[PDB]
Amino acid sequence: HWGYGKHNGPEHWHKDFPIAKGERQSPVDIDTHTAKYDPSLKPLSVSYDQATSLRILNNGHAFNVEFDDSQDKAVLKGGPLDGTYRLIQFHFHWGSLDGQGSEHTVDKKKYAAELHLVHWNTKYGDFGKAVQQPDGLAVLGIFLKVGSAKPGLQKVVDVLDSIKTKGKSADFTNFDPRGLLPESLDYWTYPGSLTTPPLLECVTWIVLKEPISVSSEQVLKFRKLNFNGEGEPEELMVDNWRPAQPLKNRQIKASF
Ligand SMILES: NS(=O)(=O)Oc1ccc2c(c1)S(=O)(=O)C(CC1CCCCCC1)=C2
Ligand SMILES: [Hg+2]
Ligand SMILES: [Zn+2]
Numbered sequence: 248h249w250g251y252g253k254h255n256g257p258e259h260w261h262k263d264f265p266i267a268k269g270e271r272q273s274p275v276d277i278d279t280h281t282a283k284y285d286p287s288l289k290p291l292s293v294s295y296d297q298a299t300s301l302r303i304l305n306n307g308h309a310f311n312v313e314f315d316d317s318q319d320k321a322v323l324k325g326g327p328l329d330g331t332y333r334l335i336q337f338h339f340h341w342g343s344l345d346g347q348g349s350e351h352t353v354d355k356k357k358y359a360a361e362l363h364l365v366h367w368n369t370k371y372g373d374f375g376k377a378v379q380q381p382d383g384l385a386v387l388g389i390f391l392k393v394g395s396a397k398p399g400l401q402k403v404v405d406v407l408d409s410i411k412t413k414g415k416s417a418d419f420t421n422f423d424p425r426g427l428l429p430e431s432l433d434y435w436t437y438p439g440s441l442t443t444p445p446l447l448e449c450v451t452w453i454v455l456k457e458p459i460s461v462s463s464e465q466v467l468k469f470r471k472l473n474f475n476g477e478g479e480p481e482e483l484m485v486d487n488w489r490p491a492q493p494l495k496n497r498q499i500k501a502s503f
Contacts, residue, residue, distance in 0.1 A: 399426020
């Protein structure tokens with residue numbers, strides 16, 4: 248099935264998922280000089296104080312930190328968003344090296360990783376119904392560069408030992424995602440898609456301008472994860488990012 252290697256990677260996905268060559272695919276390059284300030288955008292509202300994490304799962308592509316979304320605890324609203332979007336999970340995309348790893352690019356610059364905080368539009372009742380809607384999801388994107396350690400990420404880093412291979416999971420309660428946010432909420436926004444198969448075109452993307460820094464040793468541990476299941480030949484979980492896709496006349500809008 249689908250992966251990130253040469254025989255099953257982003258160049259092959261269109262065969263099972265033809266929407267890969269669609270009109271609103273993600274990620275994209277953010278051309279800072281073509282992106283326009285939008286006065287009609289409301290203030291962005293990230294409310295994660297009441298967030299309830301439950302577990303962390305290696306899914307054979309990345310690892311997901313999962314949240315209890317049966318109630319309006321951790322939510323995203325404002326900006327380009329109409330209504331309320333509940334946090335369901337987060338995950339990262341990263342590279343084999345520090346000069347690659349992010350999905351979105353900024354004037355073609357690739358960051359060492361990208362954090363994705365995934366949210367679903369509560370008017371649609373559940374996540375599965377939301378992914379069938381053009382305004383079903385909102386993903387908050389945050390770039391990672393290598394520098395100083397991100398204290399708020401270490402609890403995540405420490406648990407990766409326990410979920411090395413595909414299918415492994417561990418209890419991961421009482422984790423606060425507020426510790427992963429940069430200082431500024433300046434952002435770009437555009438309509439887009441899921442960046443892995445099934446590549447559904449259901450996402451309002453909100454990409455933060457300000458990166459967070461993480462230490463080399465923090466990123467190194469991400470790279471120790473395995474794509475494979477337990478007892479199989481080792482396939483390091485690295486370069487699990489889709490490259491930039493055609494913008495196709497869509498407009499990227501700035502909050503600043
Ligand atoms: N980078 S990203 O677009 O935020 O990545 C994803 C976030 C959430 C999900 C996926 C990618 S995914 O593997 O398509 C997924 C599970 C699927 C659930 C089963 C029905 C089809 C819709 C999605 C959730
Ligand atoms: Hg959709
Ligand atoms: Zn993602």
